[PDB]
Each structure stands twice: as C-alpha cells, then as structure tokens.
Amino acid sequence: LDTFQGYNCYSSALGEYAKQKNIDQVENIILSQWSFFFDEEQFYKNQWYTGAADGPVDVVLNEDLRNFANIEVLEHISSESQAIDEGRKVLEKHGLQIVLMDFYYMNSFNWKSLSRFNVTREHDPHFAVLTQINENSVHIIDPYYHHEENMSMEDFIKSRNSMTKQGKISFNSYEIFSNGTKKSNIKELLYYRFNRYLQEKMFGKITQFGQVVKKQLDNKDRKWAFTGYNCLNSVVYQHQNLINLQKKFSLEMPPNLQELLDNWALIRKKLFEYYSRGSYNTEEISNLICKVASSEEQFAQEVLKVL
C-alpha cells in the first residue's frame, strides 16, 4: 500500500489518518521531528530501548501536535463490547479508527524476505488503522509496513486485550481532536526541534547506546541487536523525512545529511549481521555508533546556522 511512513508505527498511523481525512499540520509536524532516546533499563529487559522515541505512543510528538497545531490525541479505553460498538460508530462517521494492537496477531512483515526463517511472534504493541468490521472479520491497514489484512473478530479482540512487553492493551483507541488547527512555518518547526535536540543533548544518548553495545562483547544473548535493528529504522526514516522536507520546501541543509542517513543504514546492517551470527564485532558496531553521535551533534549545530 502507498501509506504514509512517518518514523514509527504511531506517527505512521496519525499521518495516514491525517492524509485520508484532510487534517492540517499533522504531516508537517511528523516530517520535521528530530529526536533520539536511549533507555539502558529497557535494553536489559529487551524492550524497545532506542530510536526516535519511546513507544508505542510518541508523547513528545503529542506535545508538538498540541503546542504547534492545537491538536490533542485522546486515548480512549473501554470494555470489549463498548470498544467494538465505538469502532462501529467511528467507522460509520469517519471510515477509519486508530487502534493499538498486539503485533503477535498481525502478519505485516515477512522476515523470510531477509533470509530470517526463525523469527518468533512477540507480544509487542503496534499502531494500526481499523477500516471495516465485517461478519466474524475486520479489515486493518498497517501503514508503517504498507500492509493490509483481514483478521477474525476473535483474533482482533485478543490483539486488543493482550499483555505485551511494553504493557497491557485494553482496547486502546486514539482520537485526533482539534478545537481548531493552527498553522506553523516549516523552519519554526525545524528550529524548535534542532534547538531541543541540542539542549536535551539527544546526541549524548547515541554515545550511551554505543557504550552499552561495546559491553555486549561477552553476551551470548544477541536479541538486543535484533531489537536495535528494528528500533533504528525510526532514525533512518527521520533522516529520509528531513531530505524530503529539504526538497519540498527548498531548504538550506548541511551537506552531509545523505552521508548521516547512509551511516545509520550501515549501523542497521551491522546489527542484523551480528544478530544472525555472521560477525563477532561488537567493538566495530560501538565505534560506528559513537562516530555518528559526534556527526549528529555537529549536524544539528550546523542546521541552526544555515536554516
């Protein structure tokens, strides 16, 4: 499907909804996001420990939508019967519902396409868009994976009432609400993001990530490298989104944005190779991460100068 990518499953679902329903500003605020996080506690619990944002909800993106556009994303929690009744009403009125689902029950990505034949289903929350409630069946779009599927009502209900690695899903649905959308300049959005990135020293979290990778030399458990691989797609997407904005709005950028994208893509390839035991190279991966940390710090400083 030709769905909006965003930079994570949440921003993908919000932007796809905004595109289909003509909600102003959402897409611009997503495409201009610039963020990095690292959580050492989540690393050792093999939770989603790095990338653009702590998930599944990007609460920083929510703050940006509220502050810049007067858009609130309201979380609805109800019992099973009420949640499906509310879905039917939302589909009748709007034709789409943003729902939090356990990816365990979804079929959005074929790892066999990357020669990975042994990937287990895990209980991880994932954002999707419900489009239809049929007879003992629902239709969902997974905009992040450009995928749609038909699911049994029993599987849909299980997926929405599941204990996951990131917490308990309880039929959570997400309403994009505005009393009145307010308009922002793309440079204002980027300046605020790059200034925040430097003030919170988000590049320092890249360094921390690299330092923790170096320490996994003697760790026989390589699951962290698969988790890291998936987590860092959000950073690749933010870099691609900034390149897209540069073209759409004729922006001045530092000249190494494509090179930074390429360095993140290389870190992902090295993590994936290490996960599948094609290498024994934690030091090399740590070094690439710590090098990109310095490059990203310099890049953010240069964006504020040239934008």
UniProtKB/TrEMBL annotation:
This is Butirosin biosynthesis protein H N-terminal domain-containing protein. It comes from Ruminiclostridium cellulolyticum (strain ATCC 35319 / DSM 5812 / JCM 6584 / H10) (Clostridium cellulolyticum).
